[model samples]
Target: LRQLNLNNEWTLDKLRQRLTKNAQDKLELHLFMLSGIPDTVFDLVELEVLKLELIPDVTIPPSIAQLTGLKELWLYHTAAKIEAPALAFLRENLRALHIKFTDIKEIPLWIYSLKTLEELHLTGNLSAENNRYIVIDGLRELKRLKVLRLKSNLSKLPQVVTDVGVHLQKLSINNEGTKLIVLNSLKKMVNLTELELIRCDLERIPHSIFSLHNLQEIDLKDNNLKTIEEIISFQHLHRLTCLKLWYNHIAYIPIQIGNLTNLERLYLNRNKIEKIPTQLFYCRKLRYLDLSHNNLTFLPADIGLLQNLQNLAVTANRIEALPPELFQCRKLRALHLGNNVLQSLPSRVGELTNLTQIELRGNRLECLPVELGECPLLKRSGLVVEEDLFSTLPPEVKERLWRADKE
Candidate 1:
């Protein structure tokens, strides 16, 4: 049975049912709104996961050594003071721990004590007192730690982050309203799997990211990036599969983007782009592509080359027509073209046996193709077209589809 999600509901029966031996599996448990942890909880020596959330003054009292089976713990918005005996056992057994209380004043010194820790997430005033509240050298002891994330109002890249470079694989920080420029330290995190620089107001791609030859997925959302001609050099990071530059001001894409043969997912929505290079269609492995809310006037026939494409979102663009080959992608599921200038879709759209949701409400469509009824999975609720268009459907076909809403 799946364990129930933790919420404000504090039912002892619910907690007991989840922790009992009959529940089976790895035996995970979560508790919320507690004044103190029940000492009886330690009886389940086989428990593997423990989550303590939104409690005040949580004292894990003594005799927690029975929790040796625990590998993960969450202290979300709680002031937990672990007992001396409990801390010792956690140091050796815990592999993941999340501490997200902003009032803690400092990242508990004991956090670095979990020698077996593999993933540690701490979100608070991480850049406290110009980044003095965190111990840079202490993190080095966690030789096994691979993922670490810190969210805070940082003024600059913390020097403490560089110390985790020896073993760190994934790292993220959100420095909103701050001018973070000294990110040369990212070059040392060689094993990173993706990029994360949210709301940092970066005008250009960080040169340090290109140095992570092992990284694959990259996300630099809401960075206010105005230009990224540097993307022409991305061909060197051959393992790349996902690239997201959403909610920015990028206006141009280099033709060299076609060199990324392994690219699978690319998102460039909410940008100032007025045109697209036909070369992007050369990446046949693309599964998800978004170009919503842009200034584009045309979508190339080359789009047919992405035979593996599943979701294509070109919402709110100025495109007047879609190429007929777009229907050739047998895997296409969603085709979002709302608010565009298209007057009609082709009959070939019915060729997509997997199509589900197609957004055509905001277009100037005088009529929809009768082939739309051939989409077996396209329910009336999933069909985001207008009522006038609904009337256009053949009465025989309309009777078979159910409209779950619109009362």
Candidate 2:
């Protein structure tokens, strides 16, 4: 069933034979790489997964409506100029859909017909003004939908988004230099399990953000968050797992954050954190941490006690050296220590062969542990120091720098 994927100028006649001849009840058709597909190919109703990636010149096939059993459709990097004839037939069976880097002005009118779709991701070539004109009245019909992602460099989220917000588990709206989502709209999604508000020019999150009781993950990176005290106790969410508050104006995290027992992944990168509360050690499930791009000078000696830690990225921090015991993290894989003022490497640094990616870019180091090259799983390793001013000393130092006494 594998071919060279050449543009075999097959017409509806050949496409019909391909579908009717196949004995499998559910077929995974991936002929998108082939150039100049016949419009008849879309009529394959038995297809469960239709992947048409990198189709540069294909137009929207009118026969697409015939596919009633399709659950997934991926048109990645599709240059198709025409929209689907009508969303009615396509949305009937579609569960997951992704269309990236297409020249679509507004959401296709037929999108409303997708009542059963659970997840939808549509991005690229969209405008801020058009987002307002797009209406999603049909979204209410999707009772099973759990995830909805509509991202573009748009100025504001359409008012229809809040009106149709129901049964949603995860929603992400990320764009550069835009204020798409407001606090009011967020309050409407009471059933949201995860929400990602990224790159929005928000100075501070509204107090109402804590109201989402079922929320499990919240990513508020690259905003203007200054303080999180008001939002601390609100994290009574029992199912919460991952929380990212990186690249904000926050100076420190409240000690109350340790109360989240189920929390696993916590990202506080690019904040001006000077000291980590020792109580944070209580989050025994925390496995991934990114404390990069901060003004910290030292790590707590008990940091090695974080039993489940798998990935720790502390690049671009003010760290002159690291404790040899830091490598005791048996599960540590992706370690980013690039862009620091490290004059040398610890002897035990080579013990971390589980590392798959090690970023050592931008440091003042004249030499590295030869064991660094010996790492078994090192797939991507960067060597260098001081790439940019983003790297600074680690926090937690209570006093001035010290030197050995004259001996």
Candidate 3:
């Protein structure tokens, strides 16, 4: 909550005085207008974690190598330019390096010298007018690197990255709408556990990607995909827990998607999907399901089979009626059904004793069921009612609504 103006000479002197005799192992400094780090900081040879954020235009001094014990370095929104020699020195012991919103255009050649590094994140994109192609080289030396994230418009996958992909466990690439030529290189990264390719204009799921038997999470949001028949291609990968396919053009869900028995969270919002496959109920472990902003007409009658379901969102759709089986989801805590054409809610809605929040806005409801007042948790719930129907509600329903609004 505190802001520091490092541009002031007095503030800089005060910071040096505080650290001159400090024996702490971690130091965090947020500079408002700093051109460079004070030389006094290099004296903290025992600092293991260094976090510098919101600083601009500073050249990293070669003395950084003197802190041989440093293991993690986080630079956020800083322009700390580094030379090859200084980078090589810091790489000897640093295991993790994170840079966010920095002015780096290319992967520095010195990064390869840091063979001990296990995690590296460089997230930020250069201006579109520049259209500079990203360069990745010297990956042959990154044998121990396990996590790598790059944010830019890549013209093609670097062959060097695939050559050393065997040990990588996490890989993220945000291409900023620049379509990928091919994902053929990813097939070699068999050890990958998490993969994110958001906003990459991927029109089709690459067949090679499913071969990663160790994959646990997949984030393919904001792509051009229209279908996911590929979900049927694999019989393994039961370890996967999260699958995100929102913001696409998908219109169907193949029954084979139920084969992923271990899925816990499924996001398919903002698509053209018209219906939910009955087989989706087979995912008994599901806890969160989102199908908002789609074309769904009705949920499967056996939707109650999702015994573990807790949070459900189906807003902004064309659903005209809800199946009675929906109330069987007694474990539900939040239900969103706004901006639909539903005329009336099921009378058995009060059976969901665990309900804590519900949305029914923008619907042509004439009246609510009196049983809604029987819900024990209704007093702590979030209720959204259409204004036109609010005045016509029964006395019992309105009483509960008034109490909830106050609590």
Candidate 4:
């Protein structure tokens, strides 16, 4: 009684029967080659949700307003536009609107008139020339908007973004191959909880972003950042739990990185980092840490201080050996040390009873510790060693190590 989904084979009689039901409120039609909305659709006065997909270049008939109680509308048109007047009927009551068209020149002005709108998503080629574009001012009227995502032709952060910062909690502006650095426009958005600037040519973290005290997650992956000198700058982000800086040019991590005590996930893979600061072990709250594809040679002796560590990946580095203290991370489950210069693994590896998978490929190891067999959860441990050393392995232990080639 609440929802009706129609396929291509549905007859007008079938559609009319469902649309006239007293309790019918939600309708989704996936029709191809249909000419305008069916005449009987106007019978669904109680409809609250309506979706029209697989209809290209569709124009919403003005009669759609007959369904005055509609609260949500989604249109997936490959090459069409919705007549402005067609949405006037639902503007005041519409709470969610998602439109994905290929040739949208600009955001419709009526969309901004939806004062009750809480979520608005538009993905297409947004035209920015000849007043046929979207700017911060276009969104000023949407006072109640909580989520706004526009994957279009935007080149930079719009100034009007700051004006609506009071209610916006998450903002993502991704324009691949675009060089974006200035973010002073977001300084007033202190309520922001999540921010993502991916594939942009940002060389450094903007100072204004750190001022957003409510931020709990920050993703600046795939950029041109060379170094993060002011590691202490993140201390104020005590609420931050995830920090992603992968695929950059970062070569150093200041010892003060430990100041982000609330961080639970840290990704620094594919950088040029040579040394890990001893203070990093101070991030005792961290559960996932990735430092692969770097130039690191050693780990701090107190690495075990991270008692909550579960996954540690340091593949493709120049590490010569691992500290026995690493085994003290009793909660450790996966260890990735492939493509390194390590000559041996500490027999204390057996101490990690929770260990399940270990990667030791591309190392110069001559022999593996026999006690490794003592690990109850040890499975698929990758190790490439000399034949003499392979012969020395316990028969049962060698069976597990043999699977290294397959892994």
Residue 63 of candidate 4: its Cα lDDT? Answer: 72
- Cα lDDT tens digits, model 4, 52-155, are 65554455677777877777666666333556666566665678777665654333446667778877766665545653434446678888876666665466
lDDT for each candidate structure: 0.75, 0.65, 0.73, 0.70
Q: TM-score for candidate 4, please give it.
A: 0.69
> Tens digits of per-residue lDDT for model 2 on 174-267?
7764765464557777788877876765767765467667777888866667786655655677767888888787777778877777777888
Off by over 4 Å in 2: 1-59, 62-89, 98-106, 122-134, 152-160, 180-185, 274-279, 350-353, 366-407
* C-alpha positional error of residue 81 in candidate 3 after TM-score superposition, expressed in Å: 5.1
- Residue 165 alpha-carbon offset, candidate 1, angstroms: 2.2
Say which candidate scores most in lDDT: 1
User: Compared with the true structure, what per-residue lDDT tens digits does model 1 show for residues 61-112?
Assistant: 6567877688877778877677677788888788988777676443466777
lDDT tens readout by residue for model 3, 277-353:
88988888888899989998787787889988887889988888888888888998788877888878888887988
Question: Backbone clashes per model, in order?
Answer: 0, 16, 0, 1
TM-scores, all candidates, are 0.83, 0.69, 0.74, 0.69
- Model 4: runs farther than 4 Å from truth? 1-55, 58-102, 106-127, 132-138, 141-144, 147-153, 181-183, 360-407
What is the descending TM-score order? 1, 3, 2, 4
